[PDB]
Amino acid sequence: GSSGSSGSVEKPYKCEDCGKGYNRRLNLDMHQRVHMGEKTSGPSSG
Numbered sequence: 007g008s009s010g011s012s013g014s015v016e017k018p019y020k021c022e023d024c025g026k027g028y029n030r031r032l033n034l035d036m037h038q039r040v041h042m043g044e045k046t047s048g049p050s051s052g
């Protein structure tokens with residue numbers, strides 16, 4: 007068919023894990039952090 011929505015990154019840098027976009031080097035280096043653990047749902051209340 008025909009696609010378009012795809013392609014939501016216009017930065018000279020991108021995470022080699024998810025594919026995020028960052029117009030800064032540091033932002034990326036630090037970003038990796040996200041891929042350090044995993045959200046713990048556990049016994050939720052709200």
Ligand SMILES: [Zn+2]
Nearest residue numbers: 021023024026
């Ligand atoms: Zn990432």
